[PDB]
Amino acid sequence: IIGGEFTTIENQPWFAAIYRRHRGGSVTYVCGGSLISPCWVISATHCFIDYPKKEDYIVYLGRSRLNSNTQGEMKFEVENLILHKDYSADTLAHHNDIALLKIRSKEGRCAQPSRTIQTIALPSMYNDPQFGTSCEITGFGKEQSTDYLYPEQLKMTVVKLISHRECQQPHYYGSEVTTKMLCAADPQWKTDSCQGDSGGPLVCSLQGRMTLTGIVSWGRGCALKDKPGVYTRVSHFLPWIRSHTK
Ligand SMILES: NCc1ccc(Br)cc1
């Protein structure tokens, strides 16, 4: 996350931290995700397309730090890694960039709510907030596009949903942005998601409830003028989600 502030998992208790196991025994961070039910984490297909075996991944919930332990955290294995059949990537854009991870503990349990772990609501079919609405994004991604390290503490920031009309303009992304996506950015372009924030939540208040409106997908750089963050539009994937969550 570029700009914004350091936070803790209690302020974003649906946030899932996804890592990959490495030969040589190293484990490194992959992407964010969101807990949409006790057994299911939603994320972005692009995080996993290169290495699609579930056995390689580990999901933490309740985790406020990247490479050290948080009290109350819970470790899970990936019982089912579901990537979208129609995923494809442009030079810039990714399409149908959505994924599901079915989680279970080695002891076989799914997630139990606590001070640091909660599910997040899906939006109702085709129901998104209006443009100009303020939403929050969260992640362990880079603090500056040029950095080589990820921050050790979880960050969040606030961005504003931008109209399709406006995200169409050729000084933005043009044809590359579609109706399966949402755009969001800072009015002054000073804060944004960045590399490593992919798969994480874009959270908006909807019917007096924190709702998972977007999934961090792609952008031109991070926090660059006229290049807002692009997000998978969750409200247009409910059939995919309901079907594959059975
Ligand atoms: N795919 C990494 C990335 C995602 C969002 C923005 Br904005 C920038 C980069």
Coordinates of C-alpha atoms and ligand atoms in Angstrom, one line a residue:
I1 CA 0.0 0.0 0.0
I2 CA 1.4 3.4 -1.0
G3 CA 0.7 6.0 1.6
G4 CA -2.1 5.3 4.0
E5 CA -1.3 4.0 7.5
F6 CA -0.1 1.1 9.4
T7 CA -3.0 -0.8 11.0
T8 CA -3.6 -4.2 12.7
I9 CA -5.6 -7.2 11.8
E10 CA -8.5 -6.1 14.2
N11 CA -9.3 -3.3 11.8
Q12 CA -9.5 -5.7 8.8
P13 CA -10.2 -9.1 10.4
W14 CA -11.3 -10.7 7.1
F15 CA -7.7 -10.1 5.6
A16 CA -5.9 -13.4 4.7
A17 CA -2.1 -13.5 4.2
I18 CA -1.2 -16.1 1.5
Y19 CA 2.3 -17.6 1.3
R20 CA 4.1 -20.2 -0.8
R21 CA 6.3 -23.0 0.3
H22 CA 9.6 -23.2 -1.5
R23 CA 12.1 -26.0 -2.3
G24 CA 15.0 -25.3 -0.1
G25 CA 12.4 -24.8 2.6
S26 CA 11.9 -21.0 2.3
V27 CA 8.4 -19.6 2.6
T28 CA 7.6 -16.3 1.0
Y29 CA 4.6 -14.1 0.7
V30 CA 2.4 -14.3 -2.3
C31 CA -0.8 -12.2 -2.1
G32 CA -3.7 -11.1 0.1
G33 CA -7.2 -12.5 0.3
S34 CA -10.5 -12.2 2.1
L35 CA -12.4 -14.6 4.3
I36 CA -15.9 -14.8 2.9
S37 CA -17.1 -17.8 4.9
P38 CA -15.5 -20.0 7.5
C39 CA -13.9 -22.4 4.9
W40 CA -13.4 -20.0 2.0
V41 CA -10.9 -17.3 1.1
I42 CA -11.3 -15.2 -2.0
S43 CA -8.3 -13.8 -3.9
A44 CA -7.0 -13.1 -7.5
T45 CA -6.1 -15.9 -10.0
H46 CA -3.0 -14.1 -11.1
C47 CA -1.4 -14.7 -7.8
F48 CA -1.4 -18.4 -8.5
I49 CA -1.5 -19.0 -12.2
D50 CA 2.3 -19.6 -12.4
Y51 CA 2.3 -22.2 -9.6
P52 CA -1.1 -23.8 -9.5
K53 CA -0.6 -26.7 -6.9
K54 CA -2.6 -26.1 -3.8
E55 CA -0.1 -28.1 -1.7
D56 CA 2.3 -25.3 -2.1
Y57 CA 0.3 -22.6 -0.3
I58 CA -0.4 -21.6 3.3
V59 CA -3.1 -19.2 4.4
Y60 CA -2.9 -17.2 7.7
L61 CA -5.8 -15.4 9.2
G62 CA -5.5 -13.1 12.3
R63 CA -2.1 -12.0 11.1
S64 CA -0.9 -8.4 11.6
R65 CA 2.7 -9.0 10.6
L66 CA 4.4 -10.4 7.5
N67 CA 7.3 -12.5 8.7
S68 CA 6.6 -12.8 12.5
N69 CA 3.8 -14.2 14.6
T70 CA 0.7 -12.3 15.8
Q71 CA -1.2 -13.5 18.9
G72 CA -4.4 -15.2 17.8
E73 CA -3.3 -16.0 14.3
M74 CA -4.4 -19.3 12.6
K75 CA -2.6 -21.3 10.0
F76 CA -4.5 -23.2 7.3
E77 CA -3.7 -25.4 4.3
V78 CA -5.3 -25.2 0.9
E79 CA -7.8 -28.0 0.4
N80 CA -9.1 -26.6 -2.9
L81 CA -7.4 -24.0 -5.2
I82 CA -10.0 -22.8 -7.7
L83 CA -8.7 -20.5 -10.4
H84 CA -11.0 -19.0 -13.0
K85 CA -11.1 -20.9 -16.4
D86 CA -11.4 -17.7 -18.4
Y87 CA -8.5 -15.9 -16.8
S88 CA -6.3 -14.0 -19.2
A89 CA -3.9 -11.2 -19.1
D90 CA -3.3 -8.3 -21.4
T91 CA 0.0 -6.4 -21.3
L92 CA -1.7 -4.5 -18.5
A93 CA -5.1 -5.8 -17.6
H94 CA -6.0 -9.1 -16.1
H95 CA -9.4 -10.6 -16.9
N96 CA -11.6 -12.7 -14.6
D97 CA -8.9 -12.2 -12.0
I98 CA -10.6 -14.0 -9.2
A99 CA -9.8 -17.1 -7.2
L100 CA -11.1 -19.3 -4.3
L101 CA -9.1 -21.1 -1.7
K102 CA -10.9 -23.7 0.5
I103 CA -9.1 -23.7 3.8
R104 CA -8.7 -26.2 6.6
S105 CA -6.4 -26.7 9.5
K106 CA -4.2 -29.7 9.9
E107 CA -6.7 -30.5 12.6
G108 CA -9.5 -30.1 10.0
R109 CA -11.2 -27.0 11.3
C110 CA -12.3 -24.0 9.2
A111 CA -12.1 -20.4 10.6
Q112 CA -13.6 -19.5 14.0
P113 CA -14.4 -15.8 14.6
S114 CA -12.5 -13.8 17.2
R115 CA -11.2 -10.4 18.0
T116 CA -8.8 -10.8 15.1
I117 CA -10.8 -13.1 12.6
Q118 CA -14.2 -12.3 11.0
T119 CA -15.9 -13.1 7.7
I120 CA -16.7 -10.2 5.3
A121 CA -20.1 -9.9 3.4
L122 CA -20.4 -10.4 -0.3
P123 CA -22.4 -7.7 -2.1
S124 CA -25.8 -8.5 -3.5
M125 CA -26.0 -9.5 -7.2
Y126 CA -24.9 -6.5 -9.4
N127 CA -25.1 -4.2 -6.3
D128 CA -22.1 -1.8 -6.1
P129 CA -21.8 1.7 -4.4
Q130 CA -21.9 5.0 -6.4
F131 CA -18.8 6.7 -7.9
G132 CA -17.1 9.1 -5.4
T133 CA -17.8 6.6 -2.5
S134 CA -14.9 6.1 -0.2
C135 CA -13.6 2.5 0.2
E136 CA -10.6 0.9 2.0
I137 CA -7.9 -1.3 0.7
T138 CA -5.5 -3.4 2.9
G139 CA -2.3 -5.3 2.3
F140 CA 1.3 -6.2 2.9
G141 CA 2.3 -4.9 -0.5
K142 CA 5.1 -2.4 -1.3
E143 CA 5.1 1.0 0.3
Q144 CA 6.9 2.5 -2.8
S145 CA 6.9 1.0 -6.4
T146 CA 10.7 1.1 -6.3
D147 CA 11.1 -0.9 -3.0
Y148 CA 12.5 -4.4 -2.9
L149 CA 11.1 -5.2 0.6
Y150 CA 7.5 -5.5 1.8
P151 CA 6.6 -3.7 4.9
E152 CA 6.5 -5.9 8.0
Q153 CA 3.2 -4.4 9.4
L154 CA -0.2 -4.5 7.7
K155 CA -1.3 -1.3 6.1
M156 CA -4.6 0.2 4.9
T157 CA -5.7 3.3 3.1
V158 CA -8.7 5.0 1.6
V159 CA -9.6 5.4 -2.1
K160 CA -12.6 6.6 -4.0
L161 CA -14.6 4.5 -6.6
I162 CA -14.3 6.1 -10.1
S163 CA -16.9 5.9 -12.8
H164 CA -16.5 3.5 -15.7
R165 CA -17.0 6.5 -18.0
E166 CA -14.0 8.2 -16.3
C167 CA -11.8 5.0 -16.2
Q168 CA -12.5 4.7 -19.9
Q169 CA -10.7 7.9 -20.8
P170 CA -7.7 7.3 -23.0
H171 CA -5.4 9.1 -20.6
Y172 CA -6.5 6.3 -18.2
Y173 CA -6.8 2.7 -19.3
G174 CA -9.2 2.9 -22.3
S175 CA -10.4 -0.4 -23.7
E176 CA -8.4 -2.4 -21.1
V177 CA -10.9 -1.7 -18.3
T178 CA -14.2 -3.7 -18.6
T179 CA -17.5 -4.0 -16.8
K180 CA -16.1 -7.0 -14.8
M181 CA -13.8 -4.4 -13.1
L182 CA -14.0 -1.3 -10.9
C183 CA -11.5 1.6 -10.8
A184 CA -10.5 3.4 -7.6
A185 CA -7.9 6.0 -6.8
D186 CA -7.0 8.9 -4.6
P187 CA -8.4 12.2 -5.7
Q188 CA -4.9 13.6 -5.6
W189 CA -3.2 10.3 -6.6
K190 CA -1.1 10.1 -3.5
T191 CA -2.2 6.7 -2.2
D192 CA -2.8 3.3 -3.9
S193 CA -2.4 -0.4 -3.8
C194 CA 1.0 -1.7 -5.1
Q195 CA 2.8 -5.0 -5.9
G196 CA 2.0 -7.6 -3.2
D197 CA -1.4 -6.1 -2.4
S198 CA -3.0 -8.3 -5.2
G199 CA -5.9 -10.5 -4.1
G200 CA -6.7 -8.3 -1.2
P201 CA -10.0 -6.6 -0.3
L202 CA -11.5 -3.3 -1.5
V203 CA -14.1 -2.8 1.2
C204 CA -17.0 -0.4 1.0
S205 CA -20.0 0.4 3.3
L206 CA -23.1 -1.1 1.7
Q207 CA -26.5 -1.2 3.5
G208 CA -24.7 -0.2 6.7
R209 CA -22.3 -3.2 6.4
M210 CA -18.7 -3.6 5.4
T211 CA -18.9 -5.4 2.0
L212 CA -16.3 -7.0 -0.3
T213 CA -16.8 -4.8 -3.4
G214 CA -13.5 -5.4 -5.1
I215 CA -10.4 -7.6 -5.2
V216 CA -7.0 -5.9 -5.9
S217 CA -6.1 -6.9 -9.5
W218 CA -3.8 -4.5 -11.4
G219 CA -2.6 -1.0 -12.2
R220 CA -0.1 0.9 -14.2
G221 CA 2.4 1.6 -11.4
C222 CA 1.4 2.6 -8.0
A223 CA 0.0 6.0 -7.1
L224 CA 0.8 7.5 -10.6
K225 CA -1.3 10.2 -12.0
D226 CA -4.3 9.2 -14.1
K227 CA -3.6 5.6 -13.5
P228 CA -6.0 4.3 -10.8
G229 CA -6.0 0.9 -9.1
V230 CA -8.1 -1.7 -11.0
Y231 CA -10.1 -4.2 -9.1
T232 CA -12.2 -7.3 -9.8
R233 CA -15.8 -6.3 -9.6
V234 CA -17.1 -8.9 -7.0
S235 CA -20.9 -8.2 -7.6
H236 CA -20.6 -9.5 -11.1
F237 CA -19.2 -12.9 -10.0
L238 CA -21.8 -14.3 -7.5
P239 CA -22.8 -17.2 -9.7
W240 CA -19.2 -18.2 -10.1
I241 CA -18.7 -17.9 -6.3
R242 CA -21.9 -19.7 -5.2
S243 CA -21.3 -22.5 -7.7
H244 CA -17.7 -23.1 -6.8
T245 CA -18.4 -22.8 -3.1
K246 CA -20.2 -26.2 -2.8
Ligands
LIG1 N1 -0.2 -6.1 -9.8 C1 0.5 -5.3 -8.9 C2 -0.2 -3.9 -8.8 C3 -1.6 -3.9 -8.4 C4 -2.2 -2.7 -8.2 C5 -1.5 -1.5 -8.5 BR1 -2.4 0.1 -8.3 C6 -0.2 -1.5 -8.9 C7 0.5 -2.8 -9.0

